[model samples]
Target: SGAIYVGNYRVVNRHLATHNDWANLVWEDSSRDLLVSSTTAQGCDTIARCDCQTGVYYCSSRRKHYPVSFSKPSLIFVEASEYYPARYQSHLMLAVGHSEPGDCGGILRCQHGVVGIVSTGGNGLVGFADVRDLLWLDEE
Candidate 1:
């Protein structure tokens, strides 16, 4: 079962499937939006994005690069400050999987968001937590 914690909560799960790799996790717009995990097919690169208010996720990446293959995860999250831009600033907690140095994988950060991208071979599974701070997660 899944539950929400107060401050600095963590969810640990082992990833299955040879194809599935651990990408990077990220939080955007003060945690209003979250990007669970994203990775490339070759396990070389990945990208994650989030929508603060709606909790909706937008992710894209190149699985093989050459042809530029991409996959979209099931869009799911708390929808509270998605529409309202003035709701949250940019507070979010991101936990990256597999602490690989540079060759294997690494984390990335943007203006209002942070992400963990893969550079080599590993798992491609990402994680999502921190529900209490998420507006929609707090709603009944």
Candidate 2:
């Protein structure tokens, strides 16, 4: 877990290029007696009209963009959506599936490599908001 995953949100220093570049470092705490490692590879791939209302997912991942159902929890490699459903001008993803009940923030896979999930009380549907490089350090 990178420090970015800590708390809610914090500002990162500019000059870094991508999250993976900053997030891939290993951090150790001596007094707390804990060691935390950062995350794995991430992508900011371009989007395309993949038969989605948004008309784009990680379009280069090249999988079926059709929605499907999830039975149980799965490890989602997610990039949360932000601003609006139209934010793919940068990086964001939103969609649905046959919701079978995964806890809020539970993980599941998507047809296209673009991944995310939304949770509910017990019944209803799932919505996704992959927070893609929205946290990206912008030069000011």
Candidate 3:
């Protein structure tokens, strides 16, 4: 299984230049670890990937971008209303799913209570792997 999935939050200020070079690597220090490295090309298009332990990003062999209009107003609801509803609702749904009167079937079933059930749960990973040299600019 992978590390616990924590909540999400904004990483940058809204007033900043959306057109800027952005390169970052996010890592999880655990067994079967996960890593994500993203970069903005000429501060325009962006690409990312989930890296492997061998320094090779799994399948990040391409460049991708959020549409030019994919920020601020486009994501306003996501930042304001939608985020809270989704987060709390999903958290509650998880709690209810765990509290249901049944077994987890053949699942990992790591614990016996709601806390235990919600915590240390299933295993799944999904994300692109940008197998390019874009991240090299972060150092320069």
Candidate 4:
């Protein structure tokens, strides 16, 4: 089986599920403070999760294929719901270097830190998952 490639480094596998709205993900600052930020996964001691408020902000994704190589830069904006996440799925807009299948699941980052991963995309629009909500995939 092929391993999951999230922005270059590989992982065991990715967890994906279906939901109605892909436009309501928010990561609360309070929860974000729990985990320390690190350039490296092992170096970072952080913890989880959220869905958020509606806004149109600028973001980029080189994770297209150069998630390893040359940056096929993607300048996409997110039009997400207000801060809060009972579920995962948020709306997106790719103004330049449109996102595709490969782009899906790529990391979404901002000045603060990692936001989430590209969940779905096409026709100049994309959907994403909230980083915190990833805990939902865990087994309890």
Q: Rate the local accuracy (lDDT) of all candidates.
A: 0.27, 0.29, 0.19, 0.32
Per-residue CA lDDT of model 2 for 37-106, tens digit only, reads 3334332432121323332222112232334443332233332323113112212233443333222233
- Candidate 1: how many backbone clashes? 17
What would the per-residue lDDT of candidate 1 be over residues 26-127, giving only the tens digit for each residue?
A: 223323233323333222222224433212222223322111112222223322432333333232333323322122222333333323222222354332
- Who is ahead in TM-score, 2 or 3? 2
TM-score-better candidate, 1 vs 4: 4
By lDDT, highest first, what's the ranking?
A: 4, 2, 1, 3
* Predicted structure with the largest lDDT when compared to the true one: 4
What is candidate 1's CA lDDT for residue 124?
Answer: 40
Q: For each candidate, how many residue pairs have backbone atoms clashing (under 3 Å)?
A: 17, 9, 5, 23
Q: After superposition, how far is residue 44 of candidate 2 from its true place, in Å?
A: 11
Candidate 4: segments with Cα more than 4 A from true spot: 1-97, 133-140
TM-score of each: 0.19, 0.26, 0.14, 0.34
Better of 1 and 3 by TM-score: 1
Residue-level lDDT tens digits of model 4 in 1-140: 11222232222113321221112222122222111111122322121233333222222444232221111223334333233233433323222234655555455444334444454455755444444444422221
Better candidate number, 2 or 3, judged by lDDT: 2
Would you list the rank order by TM-score, best first?
4, 2, 1, 3
